[PDB]
Amino acid sequence: GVGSSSGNWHCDSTWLGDRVITTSTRTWALPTYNNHLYKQISNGTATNDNTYFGYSTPWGYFDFNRFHCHFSPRDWQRLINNNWGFRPKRLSFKLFNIQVKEVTKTIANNLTSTIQVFTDSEYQLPYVLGSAHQGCLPPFPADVFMIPQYGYLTLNNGSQAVGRSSFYCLEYFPSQMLRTGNNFQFTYTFEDVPFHSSYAHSQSLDRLMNPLIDQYLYYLSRTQTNTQTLGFSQGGPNTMANQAKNWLPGPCYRQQRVSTTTGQNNNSNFAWTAGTKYHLNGRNSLANPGIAMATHKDDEERFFPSNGILIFGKQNAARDNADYSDVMLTSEEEIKTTNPVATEEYGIVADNLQQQNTAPQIGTVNSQGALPGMVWQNRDVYLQGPIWAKIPHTDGNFHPSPLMGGFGLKHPPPQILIKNTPVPADPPTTFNQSKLNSFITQYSTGQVSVEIEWELQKENSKRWNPEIQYTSNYYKSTSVDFAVNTEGVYSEPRPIGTRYLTRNL
Amino acid sequence: GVGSSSGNWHCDSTWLGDRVITTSTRTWALPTYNNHLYKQISNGTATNDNTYFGYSTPWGYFDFNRFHCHFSPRDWQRLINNNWGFRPKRLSFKLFNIQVKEVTKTIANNLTSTIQVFTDSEYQLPYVLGSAHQGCLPPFPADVFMIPQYGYLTLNNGSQAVGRSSFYCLEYFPSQMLRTGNNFQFTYTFEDVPFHSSYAHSQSLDRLMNPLIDQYLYYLSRTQTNTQTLGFSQGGPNTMANQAKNWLPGPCYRQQRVSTTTGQNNNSNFAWTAGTKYHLNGRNSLANPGIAMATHKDDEERFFPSNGILIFGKQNAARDNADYSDVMLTSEEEIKTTNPVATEEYGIVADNLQQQNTAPQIGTVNSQGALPGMVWQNRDVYLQGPIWAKIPHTDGNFHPSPLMGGFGLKHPPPQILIKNTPVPADPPTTFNQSKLNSFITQYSTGQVSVEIEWELQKENSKRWNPEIQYTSNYYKSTSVDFAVNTEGVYSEPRPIGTRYLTRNL
Amino acid sequence: FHSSYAHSQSLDRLMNPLIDQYLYYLSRTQTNTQTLGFSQGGPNTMANQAKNWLPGPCYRQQRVSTTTGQNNNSNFAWTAGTKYHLNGRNSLANPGIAMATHKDDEERFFPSNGILIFGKQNAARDNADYSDVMLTSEEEIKTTNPVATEEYGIVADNLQQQNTAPQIGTVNSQGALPGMVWQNRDVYLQGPIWAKIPHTDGNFHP
Amino acid sequence: LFNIQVKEVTKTIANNLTSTIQVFTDSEYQLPYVLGSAHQGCLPPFPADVFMIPQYGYLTLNNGSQAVGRSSFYCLEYFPSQMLRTGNNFQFTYTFEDVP
């Protein structure tokens, strides 16, 4: 009905046992995108690394692939201070209280106008969620947000398409059409995904041994008396670097080190030239943030990999060339215990065969793929960070955990595509075969509810001393952190990670 | 209800066994035609060949008599690369989400206004579908189309009607009246129609014999030793043109040959004067495209019958005098194996009785009606081409397959007539017997869904070598074929036929 | 199931081309004096965008042109061949791991021992000419697998300071990394169907 | 088909008892139908007459002496065939359609 609400506001979080159910409602506004048209979009030689061919669609899409879309900062604190892990279990999504409005400036209700909503439940469309794009549900529930426009990329050769390039018409899908009295809803069940490691290791991989007992294994301790010899010693509490060990640190893809103290950096523009990159079809792309490696080693917080960390912008940070004070650098220092430092070499290997005439030579391993016995931690998730990514449908993957963090899903939450149904203006009174291009200017607004049930891994720890916990600062300040200022602007002052509790290795 | 949708968007194709169910939804706009009037329309001596008498009606009509209204190009590829034949089985049609809008310029909803919809299920109206008219559902689902105005022709003598001329009032039919909350739907079952031959013959009609064995039948091989004689030879692998055969090529109605290389054409305007025509009631009409004949013989792709092929226009092709580069010529070369070439003679017959004093004379058969033992193929259907035509209700027909291709139906899908119900403006406060001519300016828009179930004839072939398949070009291009360009214009770059798989004769 | 398909998307082009990322990347280190400028990855800086996945592993092969004049005038099929070493024995990594045969517009190039080569009918057993053999191409996996004759990527080789300019290392061999995805080699009508996985303690993607 | 004898010729002719013939009917009409072209090789009119079986060949689309892309090649070994040794027989039944 026109005069009856099609749904209620549901913003809440219920903690019950090993589950937390976050539900969040937001008010959205969907404009008409592209003037109801599908437009081919391209970029040519811009450098070759940035070329693309794709399509802009008249459809919007709903994104809730950030943790702050579901967790309030206090709820995030509850989660990270008390749980060793968490994972999504199921979600329910609702669209309701839809209002389609005609603008001629006067804005009027168009009671008979529709919106079209469908979920790509078969994953037949290019999945553009999981690319850390803007347009997600705002962290602050009172915030009204604009629905982002759906577009996708296909195969390109410069600015040109190839024969394998795919064009998708989203009208070629079954869509529910909704008038102002209608509502849309669907439920989704997450696949069995591993718990995110919401903990930092309280032991280092090279310090898993008893510090009081010698090893019964020997290591080559000396090769020279001086003349050649072979001296063997037992690894013990003092020669702990020489001890036989069962495991290796995770893989390494070395990144350039950048200091937040700019005077310590090289006086050159090396963000791209020295950037750590991968090469794909003659195109260079940053390995950003790349594989999960420790941001820095001990007492080197000022250093970060050049493109090896998630960088969030503070409120009102510039899109381009934001200063360091306008951005929020994350740090994966919690995984120092298992993952190699992002800006350091993995290790040292022999580069030759030493003889009595040739001294042994060593090679510095700046990139190390998977080795047996290697263990590693994934990148941390953040309150502002992504939740899930679609695992690409390929023959093979290795540890398909998304590199910007979160849960890798073969069948992620489906894309929810929404569009204002075009309403033609008055057509001519004589028939014209040409497609109509005169449309009533129109936009829709409504409420969107997303409810996610998360399973929790409770910490079962015998640690005696108190743990590190995320806490708000006790000292006075002009404004409350994670609140609005005097102008009503909600801001997130820092990126809250997830690893505060500790586990043994 | 005003605020509730009366139907959902259903664009899809489901392939299940020997069936494919295409469903397509489009947004339409229906203006007020003729100012709600029936107008007599005529054309006099214009030449006598183009005279007509008929009526323009205030009604629109829904047309989905083109294959691209139902098949996406990829679906068409699936159909033609894998099936020897197909035919429609049933259809369901839906009108829903109707919005009637008042324009005064401001456009407002007229919630209490109606549209009138009825199907000519008894075929009591002149059937104007199956004349390859514009106004069908657009090939691209995102495209909003204008509903064509319904008009018809009756008997004429020049610009005058005769006593047998029929006038039809479409208001004299029962129509469903629909407000914004109403929807219209009907189902239709296709009669048992033959499968369209979605194949080309891999054998020629004159090459059906074993190429290793002689015939036991003899043919007159020589009449002269020189003196008269009678020499008879057995048809064999080398005298294959002389062999006794069981079948004849299909009928011929010879068309003038035109070269796409214009320099090879006669320097004259002969499109009409040399056009292949039929004569009906003193009126000349092109036999266009005429009976199904092969467009050209081997290695003569540049040649086409002057009015013997379907010619589709490229996107934005001019209505009049479009250049050859702006049109898409079809080719029926696949039926060379059974049908005579459209621009060649059917064969040679004797024109006299040879004697010792009169040499035998031969006549060139440029028009050949049905002969016993004759076999032929119908014209191919195209993605852009028509699907069905109504077989005229006559005492006799011969092979009632529509000449522009498709399925001949005695009871085709009924015409769906739609009209905005006239809404008078304020009448005078004193009675006037005259019909009201002051109407509220009004148009309607809505969604139309047509679902057609097609039965498939699966290819059961023992051919060893790979078949010819319709494929997109692998090489790079500025735009994807059968996609939108940078301006949002959907285009069909070529006419996709249907005959790619092969069968023996 | 064997992947009887080619990807219509590239691994580095999985993002929405209309929306900026909310993540920032280090966009400039120099104003000139040192500085730290950060930009949001968007439709134009698509190479800089944060991404979830990496191309499959690489074991770089030497590039050979079917246009022989573009090749080095030497006999390098074995000397420059991409090989593995086992018990003091050198064997070609032939055809090696599944990598794209060539990048865009480089069909004439193939890895020296990185593709399946079938012989045409009556091709000589030894020293068959290029016209007597049928080169396969794994160009369909360009979207996910690195090109067989190109480097996997670039890594840092040192620690840059105000006195030492940053140095980069070219990764010509890259083992499995987390987040890496790849396609297997295509099968062919003339090609093998199955192989026995060797009975070993460990294998990676057998 | 019955009383099949497969004979080896080396001139001496000997029985090859273990040799087979392959027989199949194109019951689905998937092969080019070369019967009905008034060819020689039919069963002789006189029952006492011993006849040679004609060789099967077929024609496909041609452009002069060249094939076209639509030309079909058929391998008759690509059909299920009954293999018959000297002790085996082959038989099938067929029903004519309603013909005038």
Oligomer: part of a larger assembly
Helix content of chain A: under 10%
The major β-sheet of chain A equals: 8 strands, mixed
Name the biggest interface: A-C, 114 and 97 residues
Domain Coat protein VP1/VP2 Parvovirus (chains A, B): 1-477
GO molecular function (chains A, B): nucleotide binding; structural molecule activity
Family (chains A, B): Belongs to the parvoviridae capsid protein family.
Binding site for AMP (chains A, B): 401, 408
Layout of helices and strands:
The structure is cut from a larger assembly and holds 4 copies of chain A.
Chain A: E1 12-16, E2 19-30, E3 39-43, E4 52-62, H1 73-82, E5 83-103, E6 107-109, E7 115-119, E8 144-146, E9 149-154, E10 156-157, E11 160-161, E12 176-178, E13 184-189, E14 196-197, E15 199-201, E16 218-224, E17 228-234, E18 248-249, E19 252-253, E20 257-259, E21 277-280, E22 283-286, E23 303-305, E24 311-313, E25 322-323, E26 327-329, E27 347-350, E28 362-365, E29 367-368, E30 374-375, E31 388-390, E32 396-398, E33 407-409, E34 416-420, E35 442-458, E36 501-503
Parallel strand pairs in A: 2-8, 15-36, 18-30, 31-33
Antiparallel strand pairs in A: 1-2, 2-35, 3-4, 4-9, 4-34, 5-6, 5-13, 5-14, 5-35, 7-12, 7-34, 10-11, 16-17, 19-29, 20-23, 21-22, 24-26, 27-28
Describe, in plain words, how this protein is organized in 3D:
This is part of a larger assembly, with 4 copies of chain A. Chain A contains 1 helix and 36 strands. Chain A has one helix at 73-82, and strands at residues 12-16, 19-30, 39-43, 52-62, 83-103, 107-109, 115-119, 144-146, 149-154, 156-157, 160-161, 176-178, 184-189, 196-197, 199-201, 218-224, 228-234, 248-249, 252-253, 257-259, 277-280, 283-286, 303-305, 311-313, 322-323, 327-329, 347-350, 362-365, 367-368, 374-375, 388-390, 396-398, 407-409, 416-420, 442-458, 501-503. The longest helix of chain A is centred in the N-terminal third of the chain and has 10 residues, at 73-82. Chains A and C meet through strand 4, strand 9, strand 10, strand 21 and strand 22 of A and strand 1, strand 2, strand 3, strand 11 and strand 12 of C. Chains A, B: It is found in: Virion. Chains A, B: GO terms for molecular function: nucleotide binding; structural molecule activity.
